[PDB]
DNA sequence: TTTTTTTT
């Protein structure tokens, strides 16, 4: 009687483990007599206790195998192969369907029975978040499906404002739901070569503020960014594929991803302006700044720029129709909790505390 | 009859040995009869004498095998896989509890009949060390707290200060009390990414004299440290779960460990300079030199460099409630063994000698 | 019949061979009949003729093997493993005690029946060296004890003097005595990574003729030495462990070995002068050169720069008690040989010749 | 039936072949029926026709093997293993003796019944060489002794002169005589790593036309050679082992070989000038040019570059006593052959023609 | 039954294929029944249709092997081995003779019954090349002898003249005839190191279009190349061996190939002028230009660039005894074919048309 | 896969 390689591969698929050492370590834990398994008794980790009783007999024989890392290497390949099949064939819409569950599962880290951050802090985050912008949740949903459709030309939004205006931090929170990356163009022309190549294969992207020759009217440092950007037409418009670069490594050729430009109050030509769909003009705001200062557990528990907190803001405001259809079951499961655990009045109180610019939990 | 790879892997687990050459060398010692073994008789190394009598039979058969390095690879994999499981599943508290358990076990030897450490010399070390910064039994606890909570930008501290300011001496004991690694980035990083592979699965990492450029304005020779740092403005705050590279080996998506940057006082970029619990600094205290000039065990046995000395300091001062919850029996057991033979007066007899640069033993 | 991998492994341990090609080459010689092995009959190499007759039978079957490199690989691994086990367990006292036993075995052969050395010439070397500085032998004892204790940030010595003032000559002899390696600091600060990677497991290091800057006043062309040394201050301090470099291999972590540095009289940052415990300043002296001119065989046989010369000096000048207990037996026996073989008047005559600048013999 | 790997290893040893491809290619030729082997019948290559008949039967079975490159890999390694054994155990005199035996074997072929060489032409070459410098044969003897003795800080000879003064010609013949490598060190600092790597296990090295910077007053184009080389001070002196690097390999460590430096007429730092034991000026001379102009079969056949020419010069001029003891017998054979085939007057007539600038032969 | 690895190795030797994937792909084609193989029926590729029927059965079994790439690697190694044997053993005359046989075999196809070429158009090509220079066929014959003898200093030829006067056309045809590589010395001095690596094991090299300096006086753009060539005397004189380098390979040493230098009419340092055996001046000629306008099939089929055209020129003009002994039989047969298909009157009528600058054909 | 090459 012998190790079933098949059962190891099932576990690797079900865990979605794709690191050989990690698979090896965890599967060896099943070798002890399941019936007393104290990790099961404690209900520590589901990726153990949901599986040990099934996998036990095979794990005993696994521990006696002389070949262990070879079994695990094949199992890890099966998981990576699955990703690469899907990476080819799936739509941006279905890929966002990951991004939802990619966070709807992380919600349980705080709000499952471990409770390891109080959900009400995230509601206070959701309050502070929704106070940050006019129509904030619609402005989210606008930007969201704007990225899903990836419509050529009609792609890029400009986050203008003063310094310390929350724009990049909002973009960072927004990026949390989907990933993506920020990038620089104030660099000299040669540095752009590899710099632009950084963007390769990101689902969404951002730019850092420019340094732009006219900005020092405000003393906004008058670097190359503006003039550089006005040359870089086609990447933005996304009409056609373009080539991209890596140090010591070969070029790649793809349609350039969609994204956001952060900027401060530089002057601009009509040409570069016309590239954009839309401009936003952020500012720091009197209640909302002092609110966080009075409410810093939101900063402390990393809530303020969490896509989980965007996601809860979404589940709050947006109707079930707005969500990836089969996931709606999980959305309503969250709506059910959210609307039961929280009265409107706590949400009212929280948001109104932000309207007093004061501690959002009170 | 056959080599048991199982019995080998037990020894690797129980020694926590994680080098294939060390492991191989170690096990081959057992091939002689423990019944006669001079090392067993001499009680020189526990990693031998605890085990020789058990493994002798298996080691004899291991000694004939033709696969010897392969057995040791699989055993080392098992030990490293165990670490990787703990890496992700444990709370930061349990990690420190593990670490302290090991220091405690070693101290049980040190001041056991065999370990031949003078606890008064060690406590003279404790006296000297608390004089290195009179705050430190608090500030150490503040550091430990902040590390366990792992809070962004509070994830880092600065140790500015010139030579012979002690910033090394403290970082040394602290990086022993914790698990962790030193690191450097003095150079343009285009090929240098694999150095951050050392940050994989670390509780803590530390930087020292990561050079500024332009510090030659104040006689600190220029180097690319600050320039790399204030580009990668993330990892003092702690945001991207970078996929850490390793030579010929798998690579590890994680947020970078928390830490400290230590330096002889270069000029520093402003956006970087924010990213700490404390921008804080170390100033030479000649009387501490005067003490060690008069207090020589403390360097000769490296006592003042040791996490062991910090642990002794914490046992002495801190209330048991401040410790991790579960281990506290061992904490009182040692508090007893300290208070049994240290009065405050004798501890002060050490302490104020240091404070006035007098020799500690008296 | 079948290869005894065990007998091969014995020979590698016996010889301390650790190059697989050298091991292979050596073992193959044993395929021919020791019974007429001309090397044995010439008694030319001990690592051959001591072993040939024992290993002959196994080597005949090894000569047919298809695995040969694999058998040698495992044998070399066993020798390497023993070295790492020793690095992690021996006191530096024992390490040096073992090193002395190896050199004393070489001296047995050199002055044995094959005896190809002449003890008169070697002791002429001792007289020349002992004349090179006042109280020479006491300075060697200081250096050795310093390297044995390895007390941190008090563990490097620096030699200064013009060219051909003999500082390199002395350093070479010391390095053979302890075992260790030379390395070059006069490089771009970048280059040092796989340079210092050689210091792994070494007992001692030496850095040569370090180019300061501004010495061209003194006709000394400026360079990188002072830069790279005054960078690597922690390596001098020895307070903390470092990670070290090797190709196609993971890093290894350890404290850096103590050592010696040499210079022509460049500029000195006193940040380094604080770290050197000691300096010794060398001057060229004509009579030593005139002696050498008339005494070519010293250089031609490399005597004055061999650590075997230093060992003879110490055996001459030091009490038996200064040596570790086990070798005191051998030390006594070498004092016996010396006293039998030299009258004191002979040594006095030789040192008198050295002083006069005649050739040492007459 | 099976391949005899032993016979392949024999063939590799007996041909000293150490390229796996060349070994393979050679060995495969034997598979055809020896009795018709046209290469044998035409006696074109000795490393074929000596061995084909012996190896034939095993070559046929080797031709069927599925494993051919593995078999060759084992054979090549034993040839390499022998070289390393010898590198650590022969005297420098014995090495030169072995090298001489090899050239003498080649001379037996060149001036055989087979073999193209006209001994009168090669002896004409010797006349031109002995004319190039005063006491040419004594100069060669002095250099050979210096290379055998390898005395530290007295190891390197400097050739300088105008262009077309003879320097690389003479270096070529010396290098062919002793064996060794040429190196170019006018390079940038980085590639020197692998460049100096070439010296591993070599007997001599030669540095080609090292450029000074400056001195373009002499119409000498500038370059880094001299300034670069003065950093390598240690490598010339050869007082201590140095660590050396090849691509994709971990460092070797050995004493850096002795050798020759050639340059056009730059000026040199005293630090470097002091390290040359000897300097030879080369001066263009009109009659050598007009002689060579009339005698160009010397150039066409490369006679004056060849170490065979220098060896013939030594056999003509030097006493039998000066050769190492075992070669003295073959030296007497060749001296006899030479005297039998040339009177002194014929040789003196050649020298006389060269001094006239007339064509050598008459 | 089993795959014959021998039949594959024969096919590789037969086709001289030394690319594993090309070897692999072609062998697989044979697995279908040659009897209906349309590539056979079309007689489309000689590498296929000559061999399919013979290898059919082995290809069928090969198609089921699980070891396919292993078989191919051993086969390809055999072809590489043969080349390296020949590189060391053959004379330069045999090399050229082998090369000529290859071209003659392609001509037998090109002008065969299957032959897609027209021998009349290729003869028209020969007429145009014969007009490019005076005594063209004598010039070619001189060049080849100069290459075969490879006599030191007398090794290199210079082509110069205005742009569009055919120099690179002739270079390309000669390079095809002998085989070799083009090189670009106009680089800066660093990567020039890897550039020359291309010359390894080549029979012949071409230095394309060496840019001078100060020719801007006559509208020539300045560049590095000439200065780089003055830095390479020995590579051209070919008197002594030199080191050569490739990416990811350790250096090799050989005599650098003979070759051709080409330039527009910059001025040439007399240092460099001395390298060259011969200089050939190209002049633009209008009647060639007008002829090319009319006989475009020359350019369109790339006739005038091809070494096959030069070989036809040699066959048509040169006496049989000038060719290497073995191929004289084939040469006689091709002369006979050419004498059959063309009267001298026809050929001279072609030459007359070119001299008129009218189209070649009437 | 690194290391070397690329990158600087
Ligand atoms: N309206 C606001 N209310 C509260 N805090 C705010 C507000 N605007 C900005 N801040 C604070 O400003 C800090 C910086 O925000 P962020 O980096 O996103 O700004 P930015 O405008 O993109 O920056 P900059 O353009 O200066 O680089 C954050 O801590 C954020 O909370
Ligand atoms: N505050 C201090 N005052 C005086 N001596 C000190 C002080 N701190 C450490 N020392 C002593 O000076 C030496 C160096 O101490 P340490 O390495 O910890 O300082 P550092 O500031 O980190 O120095 P460096 O930057 O040179 O490594 C040691 O011998 C130590 O005993
Ligand atoms: N003190 C001395 N007096 C006279 N001659 C000396 C002296 N020391 C060395 N020599 C001679 O100088 C030669 C080289 O000595 P050594 O290399 O040790 O000198 P150094 O000063 O260390 O030189 P460098 O800085 O070049 O390495 C010795 O072999 C010996 O011939
Ligand atoms: N002493 C001499 N007098 C006249 N002509 C010489 C002399 N030595 C050499 N020659 C001629 O000069 C040519 C080149 O000489 P060599 O190959 O030694 O070059 P070099 O320029 O002197 O040396 P290097 O390239 O090392 O600087 C020889 O082939 C020969 O034709
Ligand atoms: N002698 C000639 N007279 C007139 N036109 C010529 C002559 N030789 C070549 N041509 C024309 O010049 C074109 C280019 O020829 P080719 O490429 O050999 O010129 P080149 O001067 O050697 O070029 P380059 O120096 O740029 O490599 C030919 O295709 C032909 O049309």
Curated annotation (Swiss-Prot), chains A, B, C, D, E:
Binding residues for Zn(2+): 37, 40, 48, 52
Enzyme Commission no: 5.6.2.4
Region Binding to host TP53 protein, residue ranges: 72-362
One example of a Gene Ontology biological process annotation: viral DNA genome replication
Subcellular location: Host nucleus
Record-listed ATP binding positions: 161-168
Cofactor: Mg(2+)
Cofactor: binding details: DNA helicase activity requires Mg(2+).
Limits of the SF3 helicase domain: 135-295
Keywords, sorted A to Z: Acetylation, Activator, ATP-binding, DNA replication, DNA-binding, Early protein, G1/S host cell cycle checkpoint dysregulation by virus, Glycoprotein, Helicase, Host nucleus, Host-virus interaction, Hydrolase, Inhibition of host innate immune response by virus, Inhibition of host interferon signaling pathway by virus, Inhibition of host JAK1 by virus, Interferon antiviral system evasion, Isomerase, Magnesium, Metal-binding, Modulation of host cell cycle by virus, Modulation of host E3 ubiquitin ligases by virus, Modulation of host ubiquitin pathway by virus, Nucleotide-binding, Oncogene, Phosphoprotein, Transcription, Transcription regulation, Viral immunoevasion, Zinc, Zinc-finger
Post-translational modification: Phosphorylated on both serine and threonine residues. Small t antigen inhibits the dephosphorylation by the AC form of PP2A. O-Glycosylated near the C-terminal region.
Top-level class of the enzyme under EC nomenclature: isomerase
Regulation: DNA helicase activity is inhibited by ATP-gamma-S.
Record flagged with keyword Oxidoreductase: no
Superkingdom of this protein's organism: Viruses
Gene Ontology molecular-function annotations: ATP binding; ATP hydrolysis activity; DNA replication origin binding; double-stranded DNA binding; helicase activity; identical protein binding; single-stranded DNA binding; zinc ion binding
Region called ATPase activity, residue ranges: 153-351
Catalytic activity annotation: Couples ATP hydrolysis with the unwinding of duplex DNA by translocating in the 3'-5' direction; ATP + H2O = ADP + phosphate + H(+)
Zinc fingers (T-ag D1-type), renumbered ranges: 1-92
Record keyword Zinc present: yes
Functional note: Isoform large T antigen is a key early protein essential for both driving viral replication and inducing cellular transformation. Plays a role in viral genome replication by driving entry of quiescent cells into the cell cycle and by autoregulating the synthesis of viral early mRNA. Displays highly oncogenic activities by corrupting the host cellular checkpoint mechanisms that guard cell division and the transcription, replication, and repair of DNA. Participates in the modulation of cellular gene expression preceeding viral DNA replication. Isoform 17kT antigen targets host RBL2 for degradation and promotes cell proliferation. Transactivates host cyclin A promoter through its J domain.
Assembly description: Isoform large T antigen forms homohexamers in the presence of ATP. Interacts with host HDAC1. Interacts (via LXCXE domain) with host RB1; the interaction induces the aberrant dissociation of RB1-E2F1 complex thereby disrupting RB1's activity. Interacts (via LXCXE domain) with host pRB-related proteins RBL1 and RBL2. Interacts (via C-terminus) with host TOP1 and POLA1 allowing DNA replication. Interacts with host TP53, inhibiting TP53 binding to DNA. Interacts with host preinitiation complex components TBP, TFIIA and TFIID to regulate transcription initiation.
Note: The sequence shown is that of strain 776.
Protein's name in the database: Large T antigen
Organism the protein comes from: Simian virus 40
Phylogenetic lineage: Viruses, Monodnaviria, Shotokuvirae, Cossaviricota, Papovaviricetes
């Amino acid at each position: 009687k012998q190790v079933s390689w098949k059962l190891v591969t099932e576990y690797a698929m079900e865990t979605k483990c794709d690191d050989v050492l990690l698979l090896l370590g965890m599967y060896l834990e099943f070798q002890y007599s399941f019936e007393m398994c104290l990790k099961c008794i404690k209900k520590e980790q589901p990726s153990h206790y949901k599986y040990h009783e099934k996998h036990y007999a095979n794990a005993a024989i696994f521990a006696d195998s002389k070949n262990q890392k070879t079994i695990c290497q094949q199992a890890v390949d099966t998981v990576l192969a699955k990703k690469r099949v899907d990476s080819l064939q799936l739509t941006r819409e279905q890929m966002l369907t990951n991004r939802f569950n990619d966070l709807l599962d992380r919600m349980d880290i705080m709000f499952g029975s471990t409770g390891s951050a109080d959900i009400e802090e995230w509601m206070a985050g959701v309050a502070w978040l929704h106070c940050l912008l006019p129509k904030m949740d619609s402005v989210v949903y606008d930007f969201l499906k704007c990225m899903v459709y990836n419509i050529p030309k009609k792609r890029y939004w400009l986050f203008k404002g003063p310094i310390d205006s929350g724009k990049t931090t909002l973009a960072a929170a927004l990026l949390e739901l989907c990933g993506g990356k920020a990038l620089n163009v104030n660099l000299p022309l040669d540095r752009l070569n590899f710099e632009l190549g950084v963007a390769i294969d990101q689902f969404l992207v951002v730019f850092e503020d420019v340094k732009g020759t006219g900005g020092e009217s405000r003393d906004l440092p008058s670097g190359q960014g503006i003039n550089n950007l006005d040359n870089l037409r086609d990447y933005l418009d996304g009409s056609v594929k373009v080539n991209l670069e890596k140090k010591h490594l070969n070029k790649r050729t793809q349609i350039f991803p969609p994204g956001i430009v952060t900027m401060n109050e530089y002057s601009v030509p009509k040409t570069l302006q016309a590239r954009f769909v839309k401009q936003i003009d952020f500012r720091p705001k009197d209640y909302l700044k002092h609110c966080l200062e009075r409410s810093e557990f939101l900063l402390e528990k990393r809530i303020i720029q969490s896509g989980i907190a965007l996601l809860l803001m979404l589940i709050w405001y947006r109707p079930v129709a707005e969500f990836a259809q089969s996931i709606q079951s999980r959305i309503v499961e969250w709506k059910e909790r959210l609307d039961k655990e929280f009265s409107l009045s706590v949400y009212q109180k929280m948001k109104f505390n932000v309207a007093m610019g004061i501690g959002v939990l009170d």
